[PDB]
């Protein structure tokens, strides 16, 4: 279901990592591209990211694994269920909602905290009626196309 | 085993999930925002995306990998 050209777009992105052109993305090439953009991942973080798509076990990413990951994004069934399970962790009522203030409070105080502008763009992307409750499920339907 | 000390233990069995749960939402939102955020709605990114569309696709590929790691670490807290 992928056009011959959007496959060529992912091949162009793959080749940016795979500089030596040997068909694999190592931690060296993945981290080099990440750090040229100003990111600073640890070596363990590079291994964890590669292990999520390395279906062979040699510790590298090849192009078939790459375009499968790029085509899937978050549209899979497992992502939709897990992301919602993460939202329910902050749902006391069990309603499928969470107050816009508690969502803002959780996003800016836990884990990789969002900036003030990040969480403001998230609250704008969800819609709020009445008390101030987002329907976080129709939110994960939006994120997972 | 006996009474309340489970209700204050069940609080903590669950409290170690709130950080990986937030990380999953934050990684998912940052991945979703890659193709809709105002951060990319500037003349600089439009031109950058015209001469080299691979740069934005690389940024997306990195965010997808980070979403997958985050989704795993949250599943490992179940
Ligand atoms: Ca290589």
Chain A interface, mutation test: which of B15, B17, B22, B75, most A Cβ atoms within 10 Å? Answer: B22
Taking only Cα atoms into account, the Rg of chain A, rounded to an integer number of angstroms, comes to 19
> What's the token pair of residue A19?
């500089």
Euclidean distance between CA atoms A135 and A29, whole angstroms = 40
A138 has which bridge partners?
none
Q: What is the DSSP string of chain B?
A: --THHHHHHHHHHHHHHHHHHHHHHHHHHHHHHTTT-GGG-SHHHHHHHHH-HHHHHHHHHHHHHHHHHHHHHHHTT-
Euclidean distance between CA atoms A103 and B56, whole angstroms = 28
Residues of A in contact with B25 (CB under 8 A): 83, 86-87, 106-107
Residues 46-85 of A with CB under 8 A from B: 48-50, 52-53, 66, 69-70, 73-74, 78-79, 82-83, 85
Question: What sign has the CA pseudo-torsion B1, B14, A133, A144?
Answer: negative
Please name the residues in contact with A126: beta carbons below 8 A apart, sequence gap of 6 or more: A100, A134, A135, A136, A139
Residues of A in contact with B26 (CB under 8 A): 107, 111-114
Q: For the domain A4-72, what is the CATH superfamily, name and number?
A: EF-hand (1.10.238.10)
**Annotated binding-site residue? B73:** no
Residues 118-137 of A with CB under 8 A from B: 118, 121-122, 125
H/E stretch holding A109 reads none
B51 class by beta-carbon count within 10 Å (0-12 exposed, 13-18 middle, 19+ buried): exposed
Residue-range domain boundaries for chain B: 1-78
Select the residue of B17, B22, B53 nearest A107 (Cβ to Cβ).
B22
A20 CA from centroid of ligand 1 (Å): 5
Residue ranges with CB less than 5 Å from ion ligand 1: A 18, 20, 22, 24
Write down the residue that tokens 């609080």 correspond to: B11
Q: Which residue of A has its CA nearest to B27?
A: A112
């Amino acid at each position: 279901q992928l056009t011959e050209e959007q496959i060529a777009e992912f091949k162009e992105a793959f080749s940016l990592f795979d500089k030596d052109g040997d068909g694999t993305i190592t931690t060296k090439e993945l981290g080099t591209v990440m750090r040229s953009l100003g990111q600073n991942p640890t070596e363990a973080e590079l291994q964890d990211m590669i292990n999520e798509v390395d279906a062979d076990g040699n510790g590298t990413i090849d192009f078939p694994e790459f375009l499968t990951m790029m085509a899937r994004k978050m549209k899979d069934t497992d992502s939709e269920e897990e992301i919602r399970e993460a939202f329910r962790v902050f749902d006391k009522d069990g309603n499928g909602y969470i107050s816009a203030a508690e969502l803002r409070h959780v996003m800016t105080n836990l884990g990789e905290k969002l900036t003030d502008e990040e969480v403001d763009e998230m609250i704008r992307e969800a819609d709020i009626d009445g008390d101030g409750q987002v329907n976080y499920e129709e939110f994960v339907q939006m994120m997972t196309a | 085993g006996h009474m309340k000390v489970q209700e204050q233990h069940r609080q903590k069995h669950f409290e170690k999930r709130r950080m990986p749960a937030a990380n999953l939402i934050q990684a998912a939102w940052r991945l979703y925002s890659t193709d809709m955020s105002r951060a990319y709605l500037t003349a600089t990114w439009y031109k950058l995306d015209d001469i080299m569309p691979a740069v934005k696709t690389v940024i997306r590929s990195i965010r997808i990998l980070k979403f997958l790691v985050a989704k795993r670490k949250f599943k490992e807290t179940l």
